[PDB]
Amino acid sequence: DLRLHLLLNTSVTCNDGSPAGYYLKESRGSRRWLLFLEGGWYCFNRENCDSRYDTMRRLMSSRDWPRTRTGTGILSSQPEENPYWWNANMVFIPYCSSDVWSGASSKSEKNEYAFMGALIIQEVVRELLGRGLSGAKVLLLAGSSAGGTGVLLNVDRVAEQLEKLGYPAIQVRGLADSGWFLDNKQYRHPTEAIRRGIRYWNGVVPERCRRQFQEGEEWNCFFGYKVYPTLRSPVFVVQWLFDEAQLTVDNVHPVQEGLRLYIQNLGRELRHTLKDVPASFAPACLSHEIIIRSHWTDVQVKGTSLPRALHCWDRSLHTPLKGCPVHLVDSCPWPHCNPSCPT
Ligand SMILES: O=c1[nH]nc2ccc(Sc3cccc(OC(F)(F)F)c3)nn12
């Protein structure tokens, strides 16, 4: 139901120099626009990117992209599947820059690959303005995994470019799903790979965060709990307390005391980082599931589903609301202590 458009500015490219693009399903009766950033890790040097080009080429090139994609979860237009925004204009932005959406570097004599994730987002926004985004009231920049970190890195830049282009009435907001990681100690023994990636990509981070951490330390801004307080746009954070990717980077795979304590401490640390995040949904589950899955409606925290919490967030952005909460963080300390966790 979402149709592919390759960028009209063909110099804004995927890793291999093929044009980037977006999939669009318009909803002409709606002033809501959802722009979703796909995830899929990243690559950080020539040899690592070459391997990714061999067996993850759709994440580095548009040459084999299909003409259409089906919107699912928060991108579904069916009310039953998407109680939150089923009538919105739907945009899926494929991740083909391998730079956690941070890059601003073209291919060249000296660069085998282009890392243009930050420019891809800006160009999608620019081209959408001529397709109806100029009439929007809300632009929700959403994303999962590397795309969720991408939201944190780019939401304020989207807000800034819309202001500079002359559209101050469009409210830009972020929804970061599964992109809120901790730079914690591993269970057995990362940030060095991000640190090297940033140099390889000419990666860019939000200005206020860059100014806090200063030169060489931009990697800090890839960690939600450090970049989020510097952001001005409203951002709703969705994060499993026991995210499978967090456990993977922590080298966690009949649980004895050391690992039990490690896992419990991870959940408490994650919960701590979300205490001052007023719009958040953080269930006590071991999962890698994301908000574009069709059954995203099923999980609840304190009896409230994520589509409900997002609706309550919309209302809050018109004092807390009777029966319509927006800060939903589990307090129970072990995976699947919430009975609604995905199986
Ligand atoms: O796309 C998917 N699925 N799961 C994941 C997990 C991380 C990533 S990128 C990333 C983003 C922020 C920090 C980071 O460093 C860390 F790992 F936290 F130390 C890596 N992308 N990703």
Side-chain angles (χ1 to χ4, degrees), residues 38-42 95 100 144-147 149-150 153 178-184 190-192 194 219 221-224 243-246 249 288:
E38 183 183 26
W41 291 99
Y42 59 90
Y95 180 41
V100 186
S144 296
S145 307
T149 309
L153 296 174
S178 302
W180 184 276
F181 299 106
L182 306 178
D183 50 346
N184 64 344
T191 51
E192 193 44 44
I194 289 293
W219 69 266
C221 298
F222 280 57
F223 288 85
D243 188 90
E244 295 181 8
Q246 178 75 51
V249 302
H288 63 256

PDB file of all heavy atoms in Angstrom, residues 38-42 95 100 144-147 149-150 153 178-184 190-192 194 219 221-224 243-246 249 288, ligand 1:
ATOM      1  N   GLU A  38      13.675   3.015   9.200  1.00  0.00           N
ATOM      2  CA  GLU A  38      14.046   1.617   9.359  1.00  0.00           C
ATOM      3  C   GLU A  38      15.373   1.492  10.107  1.00  0.00           C
ATOM      4  O   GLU A  38      16.235   2.372  10.050  1.00  0.00           O
ATOM      5  CB  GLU A  38      14.187   1.002   7.969  1.00  0.00           C
ATOM      6  CG  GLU A  38      14.499  -0.494   7.956  1.00  0.00           C
ATOM      7  CD  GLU A  38      14.703  -1.045   6.568  1.00  0.00           C
ATOM      8  OE1 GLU A  38      15.098  -0.296   5.650  1.00  0.00           O
ATOM      9  OE2 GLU A  38      14.493  -2.270   6.410  1.00  0.00           O
ATOM     10  N   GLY A  39      15.536   0.376  10.815  1.00  0.00           N
ATOM     11  CA  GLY A  39      16.785   0.055  11.470  1.00  0.00           C
ATOM     12  C   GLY A  39      17.577  -1.013  10.730  1.00  0.00           C
ATOM     13  O   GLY A  39      17.301  -1.348   9.574  1.00  0.00           O
ATOM     14  N   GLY A  40      18.604  -1.530  11.412  1.00  0.00           N
ATOM     15  CA  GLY A  40      19.483  -2.546  10.851  1.00  0.00           C
ATOM     16  C   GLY A  40      20.969  -2.330  11.104  1.00  0.00           C
ATOM     17  O   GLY A  40      21.778  -2.477  10.184  1.00  0.00           O
ATOM     18  N   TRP A  41      21.349  -2.014  12.336  1.00  0.00           N
ATOM     19  CA  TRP A  41      22.758  -1.899  12.764  1.00  0.00           C
ATOM     20  C   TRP A  41      23.444  -0.838  11.899  1.00  0.00           C
ATOM     21  O   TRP A  41      22.858   0.230  11.678  1.00  0.00           O
ATOM     22  CB  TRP A  41      23.416  -3.256  12.820  1.00  0.00           C
ATOM     23  CG  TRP A  41      22.867  -4.071  13.928  1.00  0.00           C
ATOM     24  CD1 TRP A  41      21.916  -5.036  13.835  1.00  0.00           C
ATOM     25  CD2 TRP A  41      23.263  -4.020  15.305  1.00  0.00           C
ATOM     26  NE1 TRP A  41      21.674  -5.582  15.078  1.00  0.00           N
ATOM     27  CE2 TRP A  41      22.485  -4.970  15.995  1.00  0.00           C
ATOM     28  CE3 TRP A  41      24.177  -3.245  16.022  1.00  0.00           C
ATOM     29  CZ2 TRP A  41      22.617  -5.192  17.368  1.00  0.00           C
ATOM     30  CZ3 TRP A  41      24.306  -3.463  17.392  1.00  0.00           C
ATOM     31  CH2 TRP A  41      23.529  -4.430  18.044  1.00  0.00           C
ATOM     32  N   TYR A  42      24.672  -1.085  11.437  1.00  0.00           N
ATOM     33  CA  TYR A  42      25.494  -0.099  10.752  1.00  0.00           C
ATOM     34  C   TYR A  42      26.764  -0.812  10.312  1.00  0.00           C
ATOM     35  O   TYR A  42      26.959  -1.981  10.657  1.00  0.00           O
ATOM     36  CB  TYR A  42      25.835   1.085  11.668  1.00  0.00           C
ATOM     37  CG  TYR A  42      26.586   0.718  12.920  1.00  0.00           C
ATOM     38  CD1 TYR A  42      27.973   0.702  12.937  1.00  0.00           C
ATOM     39  CD2 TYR A  42      25.908   0.401  14.093  1.00  0.00           C
ATOM     40  CE1 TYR A  42      28.679   0.375  14.082  1.00  0.00           C
ATOM     41  CE2 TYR A  42      26.607   0.063  15.254  1.00  0.00           C
ATOM     42  CZ  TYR A  42      27.990   0.060  15.239  1.00  0.00           C
ATOM     43  OH  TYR A  42      28.689  -0.265  16.384  1.00  0.00           O
ATOM     44  N   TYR A  95      16.406   2.252   5.293  1.00  0.00           N
ATOM     45  CA  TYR A  95      17.732   2.509   5.838  1.00  0.00           C
ATOM     46  C   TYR A  95      18.755   1.921   4.871  1.00  0.00           C
ATOM     47  O   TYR A  95      18.905   0.701   4.783  1.00  0.00           O
ATOM     48  CB  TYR A  95      17.806   1.823   7.189  1.00  0.00           C
ATOM     49  CG  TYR A  95      19.096   1.960   7.945  1.00  0.00           C
ATOM     50  CD1 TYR A  95      19.788   3.165   7.990  1.00  0.00           C
ATOM     51  CD2 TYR A  95      19.583   0.892   8.698  1.00  0.00           C
ATOM     52  CE1 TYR A  95      20.956   3.293   8.740  1.00  0.00           C
ATOM     53  CE2 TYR A  95      20.726   1.022   9.456  1.00  0.00           C
ATOM     54  CZ  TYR A  95      21.411   2.216   9.473  1.00  0.00           C
ATOM     55  OH  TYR A  95      22.555   2.321  10.235  1.00  0.00           O
ATOM     56  N   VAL A 100      23.551   4.813  11.180  1.00  0.00           N
ATOM     57  CA  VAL A 100      22.581   5.092  12.242  1.00  0.00           C
ATOM     58  C   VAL A 100      21.933   6.454  11.934  1.00  0.00           C
ATOM     59  O   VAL A 100      21.599   7.246  12.835  1.00  0.00           O
ATOM     60  CB  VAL A 100      23.259   5.051  13.630  1.00  0.00           C
ATOM     61  CG1 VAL A 100      22.238   5.194  14.768  1.00  0.00           C
ATOM     62  CG2 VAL A 100      24.160   3.850  13.790  1.00  0.00           C
ATOM     63  N   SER A 144      12.699   2.491  14.466  1.00  0.00           N
ATOM     64  CA  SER A 144      12.979   1.341  15.318  1.00  0.00           C
ATOM     65  C   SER A 144      14.445   0.946  15.218  1.00  0.00           C
ATOM     66  O   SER A 144      15.029   0.957  14.126  1.00  0.00           O
ATOM     67  CB  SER A 144      12.134   0.125  14.937  1.00  0.00           C
ATOM     68  OG  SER A 144      10.747   0.376  15.137  1.00  0.00           O
ATOM     69  N   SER A 145      15.030   0.595  16.368  1.00  0.00           N
ATOM     70  CA  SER A 145      16.398   0.081  16.463  1.00  0.00           C
ATOM     71  C   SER A 145      17.377   1.170  16.041  1.00  0.00           C
ATOM     72  O   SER A 145      17.348   2.261  16.610  1.00  0.00           O
ATOM     73  CB  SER A 145      16.558  -1.233  15.702  1.00  0.00           C
ATOM     74  OG  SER A 145      15.572  -2.166  16.134  1.00  0.00           O
ATOM     75  N   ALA A 146      18.256   0.919  15.058  1.00  0.00           N
ATOM     76  CA  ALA A 146      19.089   2.011  14.553  1.00  0.00           C
ATOM     77  C   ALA A 146      18.235   3.193  14.109  1.00  0.00           C
ATOM     78  O   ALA A 146      18.671   4.339  14.218  1.00  0.00           O
ATOM     79  CB  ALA A 146      19.989   1.528  13.406  1.00  0.00           C
ATOM     80  N   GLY A 147      17.014   2.936  13.624  1.00  0.00           N
ATOM     81  CA  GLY A 147      16.102   4.019  13.278  1.00  0.00           C
ATOM     82  C   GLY A 147      15.581   4.781  14.483  1.00  0.00           C
ATOM     83  O   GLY A 147      15.308   5.983  14.398  1.00  0.00           O
ATOM     84  N   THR A 149      17.389   5.258  17.336  1.00  0.00           N
ATOM     85  CA  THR A 149      18.488   6.182  17.607  1.00  0.00           C
ATOM     86  C   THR A 149      18.517   7.298  16.566  1.00  0.00           C
ATOM     87  O   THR A 149      18.754   8.472  16.889  1.00  0.00           O
ATOM     88  CB  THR A 149      19.821   5.423  17.632  1.00  0.00           C
ATOM     89  OG1 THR A 149      19.699   4.292  18.502  1.00  0.00           O
ATOM     90  CG2 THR A 149      20.956   6.318  18.096  1.00  0.00           C
ATOM     91  N   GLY A 150      18.227   6.948  15.312  1.00  0.00           N
ATOM     92  CA  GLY A 150      18.146   7.951  14.261  1.00  0.00           C
ATOM     93  C   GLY A 150      17.148   9.057  14.556  1.00  0.00           C
ATOM     94  O   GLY A 150      17.390  10.222  14.225  1.00  0.00           O
ATOM     95  N   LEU A 153      18.739  11.454  16.910  1.00  0.00           N
ATOM     96  CA  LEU A 153      19.795  12.230  16.267  1.00  0.00           C
ATOM     97  C   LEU A 153      19.260  13.265  15.288  1.00  0.00           C
ATOM     98  O   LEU A 153      19.991  14.204  14.957  1.00  0.00           O
ATOM     99  CB  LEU A 153      20.784  11.307  15.540  1.00  0.00           C
ATOM    100  CG  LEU A 153      21.588  10.337  16.419  1.00  0.00           C
ATOM    101  CD1 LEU A 153      22.398   9.407  15.543  1.00  0.00           C
ATOM    102  CD2 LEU A 153      22.504  11.054  17.384  1.00  0.00           C
ATOM    103  N   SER A 178      13.116   1.222  20.580  1.00  0.00           N
ATOM    104  CA  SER A 178      14.212   0.259  20.644  1.00  0.00           C
ATOM    105  C   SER A 178      15.538   0.874  20.216  1.00  0.00           C
ATOM    106  O   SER A 178      16.418   0.176  19.686  1.00  0.00           O
ATOM    107  CB  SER A 178      13.876  -0.999  19.845  1.00  0.00           C
ATOM    108  OG  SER A 178      12.666  -1.570  20.352  1.00  0.00           O
ATOM    109  N   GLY A 179      15.701   2.172  20.469  1.00  0.00           N
ATOM    110  CA  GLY A 179      16.931   2.861  20.137  1.00  0.00           C
ATOM    111  C   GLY A 179      17.613   3.511  21.324  1.00  0.00           C
ATOM    112  O   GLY A 179      18.474   4.379  21.133  1.00  0.00           O
ATOM    113  N   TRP A 180      17.240   3.093  22.536  1.00  0.00           N
ATOM    114  CA  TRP A 180      17.664   3.707  23.799  1.00  0.00           C
ATOM    115  C   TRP A 180      18.562   2.703  24.514  1.00  0.00           C
ATOM    116  O   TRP A 180      18.080   1.818  25.226  1.00  0.00           O
ATOM    117  CB  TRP A 180      16.421   4.010  24.622  1.00  0.00           C
ATOM    118  CG  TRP A 180      16.617   4.737  25.929  1.00  0.00           C
ATOM    119  CD1 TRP A 180      16.939   4.187  27.143  1.00  0.00           C
ATOM    120  CD2 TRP A 180      16.437   6.146  26.157  1.00  0.00           C
ATOM    121  NE1 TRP A 180      16.970   5.178  28.115  1.00  0.00           N
ATOM    122  CE2 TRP A 180      16.664   6.382  27.527  1.00  0.00           C
ATOM    123  CE3 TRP A 180      16.089   7.228  25.331  1.00  0.00           C
ATOM    124  CZ2 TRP A 180      16.574   7.659  28.087  1.00  0.00           C
ATOM    125  CZ3 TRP A 180      15.997   8.497  25.898  1.00  0.00           C
ATOM    126  CH2 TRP A 180      16.235   8.693  27.255  1.00  0.00           C
ATOM    127  N   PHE A 181      19.870   2.852  24.322  1.00  0.00           N
ATOM    128  CA  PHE A 181      20.837   1.870  24.793  1.00  0.00           C
ATOM    129  C   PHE A 181      21.669   2.425  25.936  1.00  0.00           C
ATOM    130  O   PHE A 181      21.794   3.640  26.117  1.00  0.00           O
ATOM    131  CB  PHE A 181      21.755   1.449  23.645  1.00  0.00           C
ATOM    132  CG  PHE A 181      21.012   0.813  22.525  1.00  0.00           C
ATOM    133  CD1 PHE A 181      20.798   1.503  21.343  1.00  0.00           C
ATOM    134  CD2 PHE A 181      20.428  -0.424  22.686  1.00  0.00           C
ATOM    135  CE1 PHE A 181      20.082   0.952  20.327  1.00  0.00           C
ATOM    136  CE2 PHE A 181      19.690  -0.978  21.664  1.00  0.00           C
ATOM    137  CZ  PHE A 181      19.523  -0.278  20.477  1.00  0.00           C
ATOM    138  N   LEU A 182      22.276   1.510  26.687  1.00  0.00           N
ATOM    139  CA  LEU A 182      23.181   1.870  27.766  1.00  0.00           C
ATOM    140  C   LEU A 182      24.601   1.490  27.396  1.00  0.00           C
ATOM    141  O   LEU A 182      24.846   0.392  26.881  1.00  0.00           O
ATOM    142  CB  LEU A 182      22.812   1.143  29.056  1.00  0.00           C
ATOM    143  CG  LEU A 182      21.375   1.306  29.535  1.00  0.00           C
ATOM    144  CD1 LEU A 182      21.190   0.465  30.789  1.00  0.00           C
ATOM    145  CD2 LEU A 182      21.067   2.767  29.804  1.00  0.00           C
ATOM    146  N   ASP A 183      25.530   2.401  27.670  1.00  0.00           N
ATOM    147  CA  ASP A 183      26.958   2.120  27.530  1.00  0.00           C
ATOM    148  C   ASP A 183      27.487   1.517  28.829  1.00  0.00           C
ATOM    149  O   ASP A 183      28.357   2.061  29.498  1.00  0.00           O
ATOM    150  CB  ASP A 183      27.733   3.369  27.114  1.00  0.00           C
ATOM    151  CG  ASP A 183      27.423   4.603  27.990  1.00  0.00           C
ATOM    152  OD1 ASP A 183      26.439   4.623  28.755  1.00  0.00           O
ATOM    153  OD2 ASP A 183      28.216   5.566  27.919  1.00  0.00           O
ATOM    154  N   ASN A 184      26.919   0.364  29.174  1.00  0.00           N
ATOM    155  CA  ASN A 184      27.216  -0.332  30.423  1.00  0.00           C
ATOM    156  C   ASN A 184      28.366  -1.330  30.240  1.00  0.00           C
ATOM    157  O   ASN A 184      28.831  -1.563  29.134  1.00  0.00           O
ATOM    158  CB  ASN A 184      25.943  -1.024  30.934  1.00  0.00           C
ATOM    159  CG  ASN A 184      25.442  -2.116  29.998  1.00  0.00           C
ATOM    160  OD1 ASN A 184      25.844  -2.188  28.851  1.00  0.00           O
ATOM    161  ND2 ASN A 184      24.559  -2.974  30.500  1.00  0.00           N
ATOM    162  N   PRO A 190      30.242  -2.234  19.947  1.00  0.00           N
ATOM    163  CA  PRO A 190      30.387  -1.510  21.212  1.00  0.00           C
ATOM    164  C   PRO A 190      30.568  -0.020  20.986  1.00  0.00           C
ATOM    165  O   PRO A 190      30.244   0.462  19.901  1.00  0.00           O
ATOM    166  CB  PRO A 190      31.656  -2.122  21.821  1.00  0.00           C
ATOM    167  CG  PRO A 190      31.866  -3.402  21.061  1.00  0.00           C
ATOM    168  CD  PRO A 190      31.420  -3.073  19.682  1.00  0.00           C
ATOM    169  N   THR A 191      31.048   0.708  21.999  1.00  0.00           N
ATOM    170  CA  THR A 191      31.221   2.147  21.834  1.00  0.00           C
ATOM    171  C   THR A 191      32.384   2.454  20.908  1.00  0.00           C
ATOM    172  O   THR A 191      32.366   3.475  20.216  1.00  0.00           O
ATOM    173  CB  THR A 191      31.466   2.838  23.177  1.00  0.00           C
ATOM    174  OG1 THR A 191      32.515   2.160  23.882  1.00  0.00           O
ATOM    175  CG2 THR A 191      30.208   2.813  24.029  1.00  0.00           C
ATOM    176  N   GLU A 192      33.415   1.604  20.897  1.00  0.00           N
ATOM    177  CA  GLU A 192      34.537   1.840  19.995  1.00  0.00           C
ATOM    178  C   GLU A 192      34.098   1.759  18.542  1.00  0.00           C
ATOM    179  O   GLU A 192      34.562   2.539  17.706  1.00  0.00           O
ATOM    180  CB  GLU A 192      35.665   0.851  20.273  1.00  0.00           C
ATOM    181  CG  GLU A 192      37.000   1.205  19.611  1.00  0.00           C
ATOM    182  CD  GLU A 192      37.376   2.679  19.721  1.00  0.00           C
ATOM    183  OE1 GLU A 192      37.216   3.268  20.813  1.00  0.00           O
ATOM    184  OE2 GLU A 192      37.843   3.249  18.711  1.00  0.00           O
ATOM    185  N   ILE A 194      31.067   2.461  17.331  1.00  0.00           N
ATOM    186  CA  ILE A 194      30.365   3.710  17.021  1.00  0.00           C
ATOM    187  C   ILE A 194      31.357   4.853  16.850  1.00  0.00           C
ATOM    188  O   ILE A 194      31.228   5.688  15.947  1.00  0.00           O
ATOM    189  CB  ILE A 194      29.318   4.024  18.108  1.00  0.00           C
ATOM    190  CG1 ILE A 194      28.141   3.050  18.010  1.00  0.00           C
ATOM    191  CG2 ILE A 194      28.832   5.475  17.985  1.00  0.00           C
ATOM    192  CD1 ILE A 194      27.326   3.219  16.749  1.00  0.00           C
ATOM    193  N   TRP A 219      30.282  10.348  20.140  1.00  0.00           N
ATOM    194  CA  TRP A 219      29.674   9.043  20.355  1.00  0.00           C
ATOM    195  C   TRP A 219      28.693   9.052  21.520  1.00  0.00           C
ATOM    196  O   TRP A 219      27.727   8.288  21.520  1.00  0.00           O
ATOM    197  CB  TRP A 219      30.776   7.990  20.577  1.00  0.00           C
ATOM    198  CG  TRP A 219      31.521   8.159  21.880  1.00  0.00           C
ATOM    199  CD1 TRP A 219      32.690   8.843  22.071  1.00  0.00           C
ATOM    200  CD2 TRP A 219      31.124   7.674  23.171  1.00  0.00           C
ATOM    201  NE1 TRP A 219      33.054   8.796  23.402  1.00  0.00           N
ATOM    202  CE2 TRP A 219      32.110   8.084  24.096  1.00  0.00           C
ATOM    203  CE3 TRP A 219      30.037   6.927  23.634  1.00  0.00           C
ATOM    204  CZ2 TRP A 219      32.036   7.773  25.462  1.00  0.00           C
ATOM    205  CZ3 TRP A 219      29.964   6.622  24.994  1.00  0.00           C
ATOM    206  CH2 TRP A 219      30.953   7.053  25.887  1.00  0.00           C
ATOM    207  N   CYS A 221      26.437  11.049  22.157  1.00  0.00           N
ATOM    208  CA  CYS A 221      25.130  11.482  21.694  1.00  0.00           C
ATOM    209  C   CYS A 221      24.348  10.363  21.020  1.00  0.00           C
ATOM    210  O   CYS A 221      23.178  10.566  20.675  1.00  0.00           O
ATOM    211  CB  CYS A 221      25.305  12.682  20.761  1.00  0.00           C
ATOM    212  SG  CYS A 221      26.073  14.091  21.626  1.00  0.00           S
ATOM    213  N   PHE A 222      24.955   9.198  20.812  1.00  0.00           N
ATOM    214  CA  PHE A 222      24.229   8.035  20.318  1.00  0.00           C
ATOM    215  C   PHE A 222      23.515   7.298  21.439  1.00  0.00           C
ATOM    216  O   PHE A 222      22.780   6.343  21.163  1.00  0.00           O
ATOM    217  CB  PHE A 222      25.181   7.071  19.595  1.00  0.00           C
ATOM    218  CG  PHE A 222      25.501   7.470  18.184  1.00  0.00           C
ATOM    219  CD1 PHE A 222      26.050   8.712  17.896  1.00  0.00           C
ATOM    220  CD2 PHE A 222      25.289   6.580  17.145  1.00  0.00           C
ATOM    221  CE1 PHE A 222      26.364   9.063  16.581  1.00  0.00           C
ATOM    222  CE2 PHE A 222      25.590   6.921  15.840  1.00  0.00           C
ATOM    223  CZ  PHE A 222      26.116   8.168  15.555  1.00  0.00           C
ATOM    224  N   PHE A 223      23.717   7.716  22.689  1.00  0.00           N
ATOM    225  CA  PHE A 223      23.102   7.065  23.832  1.00  0.00           C
ATOM    226  C   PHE A 223      21.935   7.908  24.316  1.00  0.00           C
ATOM    227  O   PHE A 223      22.122   9.066  24.713  1.00  0.00           O
ATOM    228  CB  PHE A 223      24.157   6.785  24.901  1.00  0.00           C
ATOM    229  CG  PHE A 223      25.067   5.685  24.481  1.00  0.00           C
ATOM    230  CD1 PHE A 223      26.166   5.950  23.677  1.00  0.00           C
ATOM    231  CD2 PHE A 223      24.736   4.376  24.750  1.00  0.00           C
ATOM    232  CE1 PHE A 223      26.955   4.924  23.210  1.00  0.00           C
ATOM    233  CE2 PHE A 223      25.529   3.335  24.295  1.00  0.00           C
ATOM    234  CZ  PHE A 223      26.640   3.612  23.523  1.00  0.00           C
ATOM    235  N   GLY A 224      20.729   7.320  24.251  1.00  0.00           N
ATOM    236  CA  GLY A 224      19.502   8.075  24.500  1.00  0.00           C
ATOM    237  C   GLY A 224      19.535   8.910  25.765  1.00  0.00           C
ATOM    238  O   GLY A 224      19.158  10.089  25.760  1.00  0.00           O
ATOM    239  N   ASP A 243      15.998  -5.346  26.329  1.00  0.00           N
ATOM    240  CA  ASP A 243      16.100  -5.400  24.880  1.00  0.00           C
ATOM    241  C   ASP A 243      17.125  -6.436  24.439  1.00  0.00           C
ATOM    242  O   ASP A 243      18.249  -6.461  24.934  1.00  0.00           O
ATOM    243  CB  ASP A 243      16.492  -4.012  24.381  1.00  0.00           C
ATOM    244  CG  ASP A 243      16.437  -3.897  22.907  1.00  0.00           C
ATOM    245  OD1 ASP A 243      15.400  -3.542  22.336  1.00  0.00           O
ATOM    246  OD2 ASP A 243      17.506  -4.167  22.320  1.00  0.00           O
ATOM    247  N   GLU A 244      16.736  -7.279  23.481  1.00  0.00           N
ATOM    248  CA  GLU A 244      17.639  -8.336  23.027  1.00  0.00           C
ATOM    249  C   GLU A 244      18.925  -7.778  22.431  1.00  0.00           C
ATOM    250  O   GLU A 244      19.992  -8.389  22.594  1.00  0.00           O
ATOM    251  CB  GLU A 244      16.938  -9.280  22.048  1.00  0.00           C
ATOM    252  CG  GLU A 244      15.800 -10.064  22.681  1.00  0.00           C
ATOM    253  CD  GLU A 244      15.132 -11.026  21.713  1.00  0.00           C
ATOM    254  OE1 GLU A 244      15.646 -11.194  20.584  1.00  0.00           O
ATOM    255  OE2 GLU A 244      14.097 -11.623  22.084  1.00  0.00           O
ATOM    256  N   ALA A 245      18.858  -6.629  21.752  1.00  0.00           N
ATOM    257  CA  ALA A 245      20.076  -6.062  21.182  1.00  0.00           C
ATOM    258  C   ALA A 245      20.992  -5.518  22.269  1.00  0.00           C
ATOM    259  O   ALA A 245      22.219  -5.622  22.156  1.00  0.00           O
ATOM    260  CB  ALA A 245      19.737  -4.989  20.150  1.00  0.00           C
ATOM    261  N   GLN A 246      20.423  -4.933  23.329  1.00  0.00           N
ATOM    262  CA  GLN A 246      21.223  -4.529  24.478  1.00  0.00           C
ATOM    263  C   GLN A 246      21.926  -5.738  25.076  1.00  0.00           C
ATOM    264  O   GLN A 246      23.128  -5.701  25.360  1.00  0.00           O
ATOM    265  CB  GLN A 246      20.320  -3.867  25.524  1.00  0.00           C
ATOM    266  CG  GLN A 246      21.058  -3.445  26.793  1.00  0.00           C
ATOM    267  CD  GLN A 246      21.916  -2.193  26.602  1.00  0.00           C
ATOM    268  OE1 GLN A 246      21.437  -1.166  26.107  1.00  0.00           O
ATOM    269  NE2 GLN A 246      23.185  -2.260  27.002  1.00  0.00           N
ATOM    270  N   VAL A 249      24.880  -6.823  22.773  1.00  0.00           N
ATOM    271  CA  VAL A 249      26.100  -6.039  22.952  1.00  0.00           C
ATOM    272  C   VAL A 249      26.709  -6.263  24.333  1.00  0.00           C
ATOM    273  O   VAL A 249      27.916  -6.054  24.521  1.00  0.00           O
ATOM    274  CB  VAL A 249      25.905  -4.542  22.619  1.00  0.00           C
ATOM    275  CG1 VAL A 249      25.410  -4.369  21.188  1.00  0.00           C
ATOM    276  CG2 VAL A 249      24.979  -3.855  23.612  1.00  0.00           C
ATOM    277  N   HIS A 288      13.095  -8.363  20.939  1.00  0.00           N
ATOM    278  CA  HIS A 288      13.553  -7.484  19.867  1.00  0.00           C
ATOM    279  C   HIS A 288      12.404  -6.998  18.990  1.00  0.00           C
ATOM    280  O   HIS A 288      12.662  -6.468  17.907  1.00  0.00           O
ATOM    281  CB  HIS A 288      14.599  -8.169  18.984  1.00  0.00           C
ATOM    282  CG  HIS A 288      14.081  -9.370  18.256  1.00  0.00           C
ATOM    283  ND1 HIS A 288      14.383 -10.661  18.636  1.00  0.00           N
ATOM    284  CD2 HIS A 288      13.277  -9.476  17.171  1.00  0.00           C
ATOM    285  CE1 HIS A 288      13.790 -11.509  17.815  1.00  0.00           C
ATOM    286  NE2 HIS A 288      13.110 -10.817  16.919  1.00  0.00           N
TER     287      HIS A 288
HETATM  288  O1  LIG B   1      19.304  -1.992  14.155  1.00  0.00           O
HETATM  289  C1  LIG B   1      19.528  -2.443  15.231  1.00  0.00           C
HETATM  290  N1  LIG B   1      18.930  -3.550  15.873  1.00  0.00           N
HETATM  291  N2  LIG B   1      19.478  -3.641  17.153  1.00  0.00           N
HETATM  292  C2  LIG B   1      20.470  -2.551  17.307  1.00  0.00           C
HETATM  293  C3  LIG B   1      21.321  -2.135  18.324  1.00  0.00           C
HETATM  294  C4  LIG B   1      22.147  -1.033  18.123  1.00  0.00           C
HETATM  295  C5  LIG B   1      22.077  -0.367  16.866  1.00  0.00           C
HETATM  296  S1  LIG B   1      23.071   1.060  16.437  1.00  0.00           S
HETATM  297  C6  LIG B   1      23.558   1.800  18.019  1.00  0.00           C
HETATM  298  C7  LIG B   1      22.856   2.897  18.505  1.00  0.00           C
HETATM  299  C8  LIG B   1      23.243   3.459  19.705  1.00  0.00           C
HETATM  300  C9  LIG B   1      24.309   2.935  20.420  1.00  0.00           C
HETATM  301  C10 LIG B   1      25.004   1.831  19.950  1.00  0.00           C
HETATM  302  O2  LIG B   1      26.089   1.305  20.681  1.00  0.00           O
HETATM  303  C11 LIG B   1      25.762   0.311  21.612  1.00  0.00           C
HETATM  304  F1  LIG B   1      25.468  -0.851  20.970  1.00  0.00           F
HETATM  305  F2  LIG B   1      24.649   0.671  22.309  1.00  0.00           F
HETATM  306  F3  LIG B   1      26.838   0.130  22.432  1.00  0.00           F
HETATM  307  C12 LIG B   1      24.618   1.273  18.739  1.00  0.00           C
HETATM  308  N3  LIG B   1      21.257  -0.776  15.921  1.00  0.00           N
HETATM  309  N4  LIG B   1      20.469  -1.861  16.139  1.00  0.00           N
END
